[PDB]
């Protein structure tokens with residue numbers, strides 16, 4: 037869940 | 048127990 | 059990227075230090091667990107950002123990126139904890155404002171064993187005189203060693219090359235260089251042991267309902 | 282006495298291969314657990330004898346001798362198993378007549394995850410072409426790194442020196458000697474993960490009344 041938003045979505 | 052017997056009783 | 063250059067990228071990737079934030083109150087098993095879960099949750103948010111800043115980590119498959127962070131998170135947290143406590147014998151420096159003693163671990167049942175393990179390992183890192191740049195390589199190795207595979211074997215090899223380079227920069231003998239590398243990697247087993255124990259305890263505290271069902275911390279604990 | 286002499290006594294101290302011997306019955310959760318506990322108990326008798334043959338182990342304080350064996354026993358059993366399974370991909374070589382396929386792990390709830398960990402680690406040891414003499418040093422390092430402090434730290438350093446010497450025996454480069462030493466020692470963390478998962482599972486089976494825990498195995502599991 038949240039980790040696949042943070043790792044996909046850049047900064 | 049057993050280990051203190053096997054470690055001091057040799058062989 | 060030379061080993062010096064890779065060490066520099068890790069120095070720059072370094073997460074910011076988390077301040078605990080608390081409205082006073084003494085320590086009970088529920089209050090201590092509350093403070094630790096609050097600290098870990100904030101630290102996990104930054105850990106994901108840190109990993110992203112490691113050259114080549116974003117080039118790995120999403121499966122692999124998720125795999126490495128979900129398996130190693132507790133180990134990465136405890137390494138940071140150990141590093142923060144190195145110049146503080148008999149203390150665990152969770153945050154500048156959250157300094158726990160060994161005897162304070164008698165609060166939460168099951169925490170004392172973990173505190174002792176971390177304190178013993180910190181003392182071993184203190185004995186070895188672990189350097190900031192060695193800590194940088196060792197921590198990134200913890201993330202990568204929690205196992206495309208060619209890109210991962212490459213990134214793990216590069217971080218390992220950097221560590222070997224860090225050890226060579228001290229000017230010590232070849233035999234002592236091999237020994238230091240072995241001495242540092244032998245403690246990785248201890249970090250995993252403390253982590254396995256920490257995670258078992260976290261499941262236990264949630265099963266007993268000492269601490270509530272978290273957000274990003276619960277995600278890491280579960281999958 | 283030096284690395285050469287150390288490797289020679291480890292080569293001559295290998296424990297006997299334990300044979301199962303059981304009358305035919307298809308696998309169930311209780312039966313596979315009965316077979317594994319039965320095997321582990323016999324193997325633990327030979328492990329104590331093996332450890333007493335490690336040069337200088339009997340010279341360590343009795344406190345350390347007992348401590349090291351009680352802490353590492355699962356890791357040593359799994360290291361032995363992984364070495365027996367090295368040349369048979371997808372199979373676990375517990376004993377000559379006890380060759381478990383990965384899918385047989387489905388009989389016992391929570392064993393499959395431990396079987397998968399062990400097979401992936403075995404496949405890594407296979408990838409690296411682990412040599413018999415590197416295995417002997419690694420298995421002894423497992424025993425000694427499981428924690429007079431000077432005597433124990435010296436013995437650990439002697440095994441480390443022996444392993445570095447074995448890696449040096451090939452015609453490989455200095456960078457490749459360090460990298461192999463690093464790849465081998467990072468795997469120590471994996472063996473610890475698998476043992477911790479193994480202990481946790483065994484404690485669960487003991488509390489879920491799946492299997493009665495054998496004499497020495499109960500002594501080892503209890504402390």
Ligand SMILES: CC(C)Oc1nc2ccccc2n1-c1ccc(O)cc1
Nearest residue numbers: 094095097098135136139172173256
């Ligand atoms: C999620 C949470 C409860 O995590 C922990 N459980 C612990 C048990 C014993 C010692 C340290 C522990 N940490 C912990 C928390 C923050 C950190 O930077 C390092 C370790």
Ligand SMILES: CC(C)Oc1nc2ccccc2n1-c1ccc(O)cc1
Nearest residue numbers: 317318320321358359362395396479
């Ligand atoms: C004490 C006993 C039950 O031990 C085990 N529990 C296991 C769970 C999963 C995989 C292997 C396991 N072994 C095991 C048994 C014998 C051996 O030489 C190495 C490992």
